[PDB]
Amino acid sequence: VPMHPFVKALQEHFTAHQNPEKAEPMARYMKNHFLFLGIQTPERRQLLKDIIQIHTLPDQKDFQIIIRELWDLPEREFQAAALDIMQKYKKHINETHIPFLEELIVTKSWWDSVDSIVPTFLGDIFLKHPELISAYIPKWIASDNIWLQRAAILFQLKYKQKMDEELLFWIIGQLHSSKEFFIQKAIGWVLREYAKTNPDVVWEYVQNNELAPLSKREAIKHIKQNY
Template sequence: MRDYTQQLVSFFHEHGNTEVSLPMKKYMKDHFEFLGIRSPERKKLLQEFLRVHGKPTFHEYEKICLELWAQPEREFQYNALELLRKYRRKFEPSTVSLLETLIITKSWWDTVDHIASDLVGFLFQKHPDLIPMYTEKWLGSQNIWLQRTVILFQLKYKEKTDLRLLYQAILACKDSKEFFIQKAIGWALREYSKINSKAIVEFVESHTLAPLSKREALKRIDFPQGDDLGTEPIKK
């Protein structure tokens, strides 16, 4: 492990709190260990560490992120993502391999959703030529986290969303029984409904989606009484 990584790991271990770590672990269904550092404090500690030690060099940051990812405590995966976000304007096409590794390693919604919307989404905007190859590869991978990434990477695109691509991803996954896929489909459709609710209603009417996906997709759409596509009207 590089000296930089070791110093960061040691620094955070000094601030662990067992009383906090146990409920954090329980919240994550016991999938991961925690030091017991809540998000606001963790971000402050990382900034404090960076003020003293500086950021890793551009040539080192990927390897340091992988070293942090290998640590058992979840806070280090969060720190790795914070570091990656600081470097994302320097992302190169090859960065997609690193992001893919992070998506399929220690996978859970808390890291995958951040990678999808903040990192993959940014990389694909910067290098759109990557989109056809990797969306096709990830959709066909049978890995639910790669599939979820394809569904969610355009969350922040707003009017720039490629709706054809979003629909393509949803239709490829719509029959999945996986909760995290069904939820992602609804989330992506709901987010775009803020831009064009009519398009989303038409899509939901025209396709058979899982009840969870349908319910989530239409959450922000206010229907007239009796015209709710089988969902409860939004209460004001």
């Protein structure tokens, strides 16, 4: 049972605003891996805002406590809310929190939580601490955990001109022979996105290095008409 007063307040307020008619299709969309209360993103964020306006944002010493307690609640909106909360503490998040973020990635894993952790929170940490990438990314690739592998692929997704091209291509080469949908698809996504910034090097990469056909097709869907 959650014990932090902020989490208890949030749980009560979310539960009081549940919508069972939305809960069923929301849970089906995530392959019924999770129960849902039936609260979509606009309403979920406003309910969190209500609780912050009443109680104020808890002290930064508590932010991991709060996120952990929310992660253990059954309904999926509590994990989505915990990530909204983590965004409000981002000035206090640094390299010492990478293991905490790893834990969140591999606990109650699915594409919604993992994608909300990786390009923003890990992306920002490794921009400030790029000399720490080698302590994590190769480990994640070798772990055979598909969500840490997707993290290795997508932490640079929002980098645009900051992208470390040789690193991106090494990561992708290490994972290109994965059978896994969420890995093949992440490779396609990150290549398509980076092609918005540096289309010529993505084209050269895709024409000279092996990729699953899903990955290759997705990578080039916007630039192929230029060649």
